[PDB]
Design a protein around this ligand. Structure first.
Ligand SMILES: [Mg+2]
Ligand SMILES: [Mg+2]
Ligand SMILES: [Mg+2]
Ligand SMILES: [Mg+2]
Ligand SMILES: [Mg+2]
Ligand SMILES: [Mg+2]
Ligand code: NA
Length: 326
DNA sequence: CCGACAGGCGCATCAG
DNA sequence: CTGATGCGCAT
DNA sequence: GTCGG
């Protein structure tokens, strides 16, 4: 809430640039700026003060001065009053509808939940499920519910094979009091970077979670990434729990630490860390950290035995998961 | 200035 | 069909 | 939209 007006303004501009303008680097620029400002431990008194922060430049500083003086931004007032911009922005809130499809839909006269719900024939699988659970997917998940979900996933995984290790990542691993969805990092010894010695390792877990009615729908499903929907069991005469988004990522066992770093985030933290790695001459993904050659082609994976090792390579002091949040 | 901006999975689409 | 591209998504 | 060389 310190500088919350400013960070809200910048987040709104980010979403506009992503959803309406389709300018992913401007979106990221506004998000980077929002993040550094959120971290800044002083009440910002001018745009020039803000501009000293990395990621805040001339145009954001001028917007900040406007906001400080008036309590609003004309650019955003205008955006808020434009039906077409608002409609496109709205439709992107449905899982599976991004900026491109949102624009195409609004151009075809589809601009409301009502319009989506009578035009389901125009929606792909992912989008149909996103619409079905539109309200539920907007709701956050209390940590208490995350803990019940974790208990279910870890116990069902164990029933399939005691050699699986499932780790709940994302905001949950960062200590958050509520989470947007559940993210599960999965490993099994027969899946490494050197061999897949058993097939269907992810499939058997997904199937077991479906069998016990925890997983209720599938948005997408490959050999290493599952994206879908789950729901806690509720008791007699109690309202149902909201359906929840779940992501499962099966990662090579020997690459657990790059995997857990990726899947713990936050998203902005990973972008900042990965960008820092590049400046240091390395590239990081969910599998490995590799050095960069002169043309920017990656070399051989470096040895990693801990999350901290990755930080060490790029000369960052270790940040515990709880300090990787926005 | 100005090229770079994080990385990649699953899925759809198009050219051939 | 394969291969290249882009979308929408994950952190 | 912002930054590092
Ligand atoms: Mg600055
Ligand atoms: Mg969407
Ligand atoms: Mg999450
Ligand atoms: Mg997720
Ligand atoms: Mg599928
Ligand atoms: Mg997220
Ligand atoms: Na790799």
């Amino acid at each position: 809430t310190l500088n919350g007006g400013i960070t809200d303004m910048l987040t709104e501009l980010a979403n506009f640039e992503k959803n309406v303008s389709q300018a992913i680097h401007k979106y990221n620029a506004y998000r980077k700026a929002a993040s550094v400002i959120a971290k800044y431990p002083h009440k910002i008194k001018s745009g020039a003060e803000a501009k000293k922060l990395p990621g805040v430049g001339t145009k954001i500083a001028e917007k900040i001065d406007e906001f400080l003086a008036t309590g609003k931004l004309r650019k955003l007032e205008k955006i808020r009053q434009d039906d077409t911009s608002s409609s496109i922005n709205f439709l992107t809130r449905v899982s599976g509808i991004g900026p491109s499809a949102a624009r195409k839909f609004v151009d075809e006269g589809i601009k409301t939940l009502e319009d989506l719900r009578k035009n389901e024939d125009k929606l792909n699988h992912h989008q149909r499920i996103g619409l079905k659970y539109f309200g539920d997917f907007e709701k956050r998940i209390p940590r208490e519910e995350m803990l019940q979900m974790q208990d279910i996933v870890l116990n069902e995984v164990k029933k399939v094979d005691s050699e699986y290790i499932a780790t709940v990542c994302g905001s949950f691993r960062r200590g958050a009091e509520s989470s947007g969805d559940m993210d599960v990092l999965l490993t099994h010894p027969s899946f490494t970077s050197e061999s897949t010695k058993q097939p269907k390792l992810l499939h058997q877990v997904v199937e077991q979670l479906q069998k016990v009615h925890f997983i209720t729908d599938t948005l997408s499903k490959g050999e290493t990434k599952f994206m879908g929907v789950c729901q806690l069991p509720s008791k007699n005469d109690e309202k149902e729990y909201p359906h929840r988004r779940i992501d499962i990522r099966l990662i090579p066992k020997d690459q657990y630490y790059c995997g857990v770093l990726y899947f713990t985030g936050s998203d902005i933290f990973n972008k900042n860390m990965r960008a820092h790695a590049l400046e240091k001459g390395f590239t990081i993904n969910e599998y490995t950290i590799r050095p960069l050659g002169v043309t920017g082609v990656a070399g051989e994976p470096l040895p990693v035995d801990s999350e901290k090792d990755i930080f060490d390579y790029i000369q960052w002091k270790y940040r515990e998961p709880k300090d990787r949040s926005e």
